Design a protein around this ligand. Structure first.
Ligand SMILES: N[C@@H]1[C@@H](O)[C@@H](C(=O)O)O[C@@H]2[C@@H]1O[C@@H](n1ccc(=O)[nH]c1=O)[C@@H]2OP(=O)(O)O
Ligand SMILES: [Cl-]
Ligand SMILES: [V+3]
Length: 216
């Protein structure tokens, strides 16, 4: 039994998990967290279940993918996030805080002060949902992908793949989509990555934060 006392929990995000992320510089500069969230367990159940749009692109497009997305919009800002769980309003407030800017600056020596961001729920949940090898758009100065699954059968597919080239097989590292894990990097001419296609209809739940100066 635990003690009859308080315990410290400064924020939804453990900013020290960003400052002290695993940091690669080759193949490209990318941070990988563990235990990003101070209270991870309830986040899976609170992830939104409606409001998504399915989207796909095939070989006609410069990247291929199949997934569903629900963006945070100005409508959510104006209605005090009434259509989302309270934890997503808190996440938005923390991403928009000086603390997040300070953590990123310490981790990767990039200053995001005064930049803009988008924030969206990206759900992969049908067999074959994936995204093909891509760098991210160069208009993006930083991308931070956060995962929310409480459990994940690795044999399901769905790993984030860090790649050495535009080739699904040229894998340098993998990240499992488990709550607390996240990946943040500046898009560059060689920041190749992908998501291994799902082999099962199992929901793989993420949020992407996209930071930029020029709208895209
Ligand atoms: N966020 C990722 C990221 O991969 C990014 C990049 O390339 O950095 O491209 C983004 C991609 O999701 C696509 N998407 C789809 C529906 C929507 O509402 N918003 C949205 O962003 C778009 O892909 P496109 O169709 O090639 O433009
Ligand atoms: Cl500008
Ligand atoms: V990407």
């Amino acid at each position: 039994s635990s003690g009859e006392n308080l315990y410290f929990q400064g924020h939804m995000i453990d900013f020290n998990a960003i400052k002290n992320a695993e940091l690669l510089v080759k193949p490209f500069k990318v941070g990988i967290t563990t235990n990003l969230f101070t209270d991870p367990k309830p986040l899976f159940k609170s992830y939104p279940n409606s409001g998504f749009h399915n989207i796909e692109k095939g070989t006609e497009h410069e990247k291929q993918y199949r997934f569903s997305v629900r963006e945070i919009t100005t409508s959510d800002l104006e209605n005090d996030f009434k259509n989302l769980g309270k934890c997503w309003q808190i996440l938005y407030q923390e991403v928009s805080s000086v603390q997040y800017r300070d953590a990123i600056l310490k981790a990767i020596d990039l200053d995001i002060s005064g930049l803009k961001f988008k924030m969206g729920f990206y759900k992969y949940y049908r067999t074959g949902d994936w995204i093909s090898p891509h760098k991210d758009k160069p208009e993006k100065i930083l991308n931070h992908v956060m995962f929310f699954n409480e459990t994940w059968n690795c044999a399901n597919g769905g790993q984030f793949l860090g790649l050495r080239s535009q080739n699904m097989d040229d894998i340098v590292f993998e990240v499992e989509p488990l709550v607390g894990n996240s990946v943040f990097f500046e898009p560059r001419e060689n920041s190749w990555h992908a998501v291994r296609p799902l082999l099962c209809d199992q929901p793989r739940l993420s949020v992407q934060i996209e930071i930029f100066r020029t709208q895209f």
